[PDB]
């Protein structure tokens, strides 16, 4: 029987979070650090993210705005730099690892002057301001939250969207079940599990897309656009 929830795989919630914080504290503040040695795929990723996002920026009644985005688990700001700052007037970043947010000030360069808030906080402890963001971007971090905390964080994100705003989750997906990585202290969930959590947060899918052109050996990656 596959496991269907984090409650079947996490021995100790406090250790699940503390071990992950210790893991990221020892990763270099570089794109290759953010991407687990796959820094070279960054451009494939950003190009696909941009095309996925631009779906929602078309003129019409539901056009997503371009005033402010939130980059969740932003790290040094790879996505903030290459995807979000060029499209949004301001961007906020949230990440648990202070040293990454410090490095971001260098990494982002001149355009980083349009980063407004640098929040050093776990997502599980973060309440974004109501009615603040056009796009909330959550990439390669949801596996660091328990199911309960991910559901709650998505509920708080829903409350922080502007009119026509969206949440985007982009992450690894397991073929089946819920799989623990005890080295970095994270989980990989199958598409049914992720969809269950999104539904439980009172969100609906606008779109779902598999990332193409990835190395054959890694977990498949999907993007979801939600409101």
């Amino acid at each position: 029987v596959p496991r269907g929830s984090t409650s079947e795989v996490i021995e100790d919630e406090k250790q699940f979070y503390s071990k992950a914080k210790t893991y990221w504290k020892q990763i270099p503040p570089t794109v290759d650090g953010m991407l687990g040695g796959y820094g070279h795929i960054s451009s494939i990723d950003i190009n696909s993210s941009r095309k996925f996002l631009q779906r929602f920026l078309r003129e019409g009644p539901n056009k997503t705005g371009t005033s402010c985005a939130l980059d969740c688990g932003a790290g040094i700001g790879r996505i903030t730099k290459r995807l979000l700052l060029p499209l949004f007037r301001e961007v906020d970043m949230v990440d648990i690892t202070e040293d990454f947010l410090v490095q971001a000030k260098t990494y982002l360069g001149e355009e980083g002057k349009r980063v407004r808030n640098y929040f050093c906080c776990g997502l599980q402890d973060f309440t974004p301001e109501p009615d603040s963001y056009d796009v909330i971007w959550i990439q390669w971090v949801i596996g660091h939250l328990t199911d309960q905390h991910l559901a709650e964080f998505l509920r708080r994100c829903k409350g922080s969207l502007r009119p026509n705003g969206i949440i985007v989750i982009k992450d690894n997906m397991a073929q089946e079940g819920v799989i623990l990585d005890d080295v970095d202290s994270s989980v990989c969930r199958d598409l049914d599990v992720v969809r269950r959590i999104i539904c439980s947060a009172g969100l609906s899918l606008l779109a779902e897309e598999r990332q193409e052109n990835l190395p054959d050996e890694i977990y498949h990656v999907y993007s979801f656009a939600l409101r």
Partner: peptide, 6 residues
């Protein structure tokens, strides 16, 4: 992050 299937 991009990760090898365990």
């Amino acid at each position: 992050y991009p990760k090898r299937i365990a």
